[PDB]
Amino acid sequence: AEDCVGRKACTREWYPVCGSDGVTYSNPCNFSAQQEQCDPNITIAHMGEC
């Protein structure tokens, strides 16, 4: 994808985290999938939905 913004929806489970973009991830899969498509370079900012 290269350039995509927001969250990419995955729903295997709900462990919410926030990415360094300040973005709410529904679960690890959300963080992984969205970033592998968009921004692999951010880190988990904090545990819990943003």
Swiss-Prot record:
Protein name from the UniProt record: Protease inhibitor 2
Gene Ontology molecular-function annotations: serine-type endopeptidase inhibitor activity
SMART domains: KAZAL
Pfam families to which the protein is assigned, alphabetical: Kazal_1
PANTHER family: SERINE PROTEASE INHIBITOR, SERINE PROTEASE INHIBITOR KAZAL-TYPE 11-RELATED
Organism: Cenchritis muricatus (Beaded periwinkle)
Limits of the Kazal-like domain: 2-50
Role description: Serine protease inhibitor. Strongly inhibits human neutrophil elastase and trypsin, also inhibits porcine pancreatic elastase and subtilisin A. Does not inhibit chymotrypsin, plasma kallikrein, pancreatic kallikrein, thrombin or papain.
Disulfide cysteine pairs (residue numbers): 10-29, 18-50
UniProt keyword terms in alphabetical order: Disulfide bond, Glycoprotein, Protease inhibitor, Serine protease inhibitor
